[PDB]
Design a protein around this ligand. Structure first.
Ligand SMILES: [Ca+2]
Length: 556
């Protein structure tokens, strides 16, 4: 047969709010994204995944939807959305929208009705329960602060919200609710959308009776929330009633789920989702409280990739990303963002990103080498999640304001949300007004305009890597094999398909290193290298690597 277009595609994630503003209000919009399609096309992007673009009070920047069938006021009108669609099509590009159906805004008409009374027709579109022993129904904690249960004096019961208090969870146990969600998905799919990314898709099913989480589960409640007994039953139904009638690719954000359960979501034979967004890697050095970091090495990094790949099997498929809107900047996180190493390590990570088995997603700005932001006070963060950490850890006396700042500065989601750096004009050319989130001062050195015309820029390297990937089947659908899972210095692996085998060698140390190819393996040709003074001689049996050097070679 043949592999789907999404298995050989290179996606680009656009956070509209911080991509390109065109009316000076400081917030990115659709016209802004539409004006930059030539930029993405030139980069070689095949499809774009945009974060939530629906009507929202923005307590969680788009993830709290008040109307699934209207566009967010800040981004434009439905017409603007249609225009984005048409322009993407004119360039042969596809659009993947974000689907947020684990919860809705508390301003959604379903919730407004739901809270009116216990006998209301929409009561069960959400989860309402009586408190217990004078307190909340159970000990469920919220990702964004305090209890996952909020009492509503209108009825006296508590409603469930894994996330923000203004993000009540939708009740998937209710048939009419599921039917409404399916009809909503068809609304967008009928418009031609080519893909859907499902926000926290593993938390749709809630545990019957809502018993308390054990002390252990409390430590990792995110995992417990992914163990609903009707989860896959619901996913199979959605696929049967919706996706079976369209030709769109589905990608689930399987956050919190044990890696061993991932196959249940993506094995094609199961008819659930097409691709998986896993977080074992991107959160591989994150503490359980989600705001502290834990030192890891390349060995942990590669081994995690190892496991995630193995999980895909023969019928599953992974997406591969080193960054997104919920995590610190790739180069700062996995590379070395210091001035002398930023560019070298950003290129090294690009090589990794574009040579991994699965569908790679490039997060806006990483192709430029953008870094974390130099937060100075807690007021510099906008993220509701940080306010949650303050409520749960500072106001409770567990940590000082300074300790939260020091640590959250390295992990905060806002690191990835600062305005895209287009050029060195006012606010990096992002807006003519005041950006909703301050632009990183390093935009004077790191910006698209400066990198586009420079053959040695991080941008040009990405572009070239993307062309190489597009021209080399093995680099997308080829098998993957880690040459040495225990090596904590140089990441080396092969990609093979129909006889053609390629070698990827990336030095993760800011020091010279050597690499000996597996016995019998020799270099045939060098497709590309970064930070390398010279390609290896044809027939080479080993490689001498410069600090943070990366390379792709066809072997024999
Ligand atoms: Ca705007």
């Amino acid at each position: 047969p043949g592999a789907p277009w999404w298995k050989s595609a290179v996606f680009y994630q656009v956070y509209p709010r911080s991509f390109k503003d065109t009316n000076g209000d400081g917030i990115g919009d659709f016209k802004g994204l539409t004006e930059k399609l030539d930029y993405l096309k030139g980069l070689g992007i095949d499809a774009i995944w945009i974060n939530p673009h629906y009507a929202s009070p923005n307590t969680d920047n788009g993830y709290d939807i008040s109307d699934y069938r209207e566009v967010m006021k800040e981004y434009g009108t439905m017409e603007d959305f249609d225009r984005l669609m048409a322009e993407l099509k004119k360039r042969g590009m596809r659009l993947m929208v974000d689907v947020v159906i684990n919860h809705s805004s508390d301003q959604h008409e379903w919730f407004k009705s739901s809270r009116a009374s216990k006998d209301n027709p929409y009561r069960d579109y959400y989860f309402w329960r009586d408190g217990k022993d004078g307190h909340e129904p159970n000990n469920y904690p919220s990702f964004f602060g305090g209890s996952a249960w909020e009492k509503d004096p209108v009825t006296g019961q508590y409603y469930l919200h894994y996330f923000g208090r203004q993000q009540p969870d939708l009740n998937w146990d209710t048939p009419k609710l599921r039917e409404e969600l399916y009809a909503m998905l068809r609304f967008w799919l009928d418009k031609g959308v080519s893909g859907m990314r499902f926000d926290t898709v593993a938390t749709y099913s809630k545990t019957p009776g809502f018993p308390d989480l054990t002390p252990e589960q409390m430590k990792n409640f995110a995992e417990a929330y992914t163990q609903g007994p009707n989860l896959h039953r619901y996913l199979q139904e959605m696929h049967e009633k919706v996706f079976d009638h369209y030709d769109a690719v589905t990608a689930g954000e399987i956050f919190g789920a044990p890696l061993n359960q991932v196959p249940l979501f993506i094995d094609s034979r199961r008819k659930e989702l097409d691709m998986a967004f896993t977080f074992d890697l991107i959160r591989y050095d994150r503490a359980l409280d989600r705001w502290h970091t834990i030192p890891r090495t390349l060995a942990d990094f590669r081994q995690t990739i190892d496991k995630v790949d193995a999980i895909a099997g023969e019928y599953g498929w992974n997406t591969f990303f080193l960054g997104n809107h919920d995590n610190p900047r790739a180069v700062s996180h996995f590379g070395d963002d210091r001035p002398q190493w930023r560019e070298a390590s950003a290129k090294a990570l690009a090589t990794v990103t574009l040579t991994q088995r699965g569908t790679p997603f490039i997060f806006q700005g990483d192709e430029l080498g953008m870094t974390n932001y130099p937060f100075k006070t807690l007021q510099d963060f906008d993220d509701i999640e940080v306010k949650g950490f303050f409520q749960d850890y500072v106001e409770t006396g567990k940590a000082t304001a300074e300790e939260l700042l020091t640590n959250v500065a390295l992990t905060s989601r806002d690191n990835a949300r600062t305005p895209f750096q287009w050029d060195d004009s006012a606010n990096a050319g992002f807006t003519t007004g005041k950006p909703w989130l301050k632009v990183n001062p390093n935009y004077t050195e790191i910006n698209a305009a400066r990198e586009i015309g420079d053959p040695k820029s991080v941008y040009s390297f990405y572009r070239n890597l993307i062309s190489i990937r597009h021209e080399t089947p093995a680099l997308s659908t080829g098998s993957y094999r880690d040459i040495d899972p225990s090596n904590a210095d140089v990441y080396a692996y092969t990609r093979s398909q129909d006889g053609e085998t390629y070698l990827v060698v990336v030095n993760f140390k800011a020091e010279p290193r050597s690499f000996t190819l597996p016995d019998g393996m020799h270099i045939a040709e060098t497709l590309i290298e970064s930070s390398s003074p010279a390609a290896p001689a044809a027939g080479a049996a080993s490689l001498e690597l410069q600090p943070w050097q990366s390379g792709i070679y066809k072997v024999k």
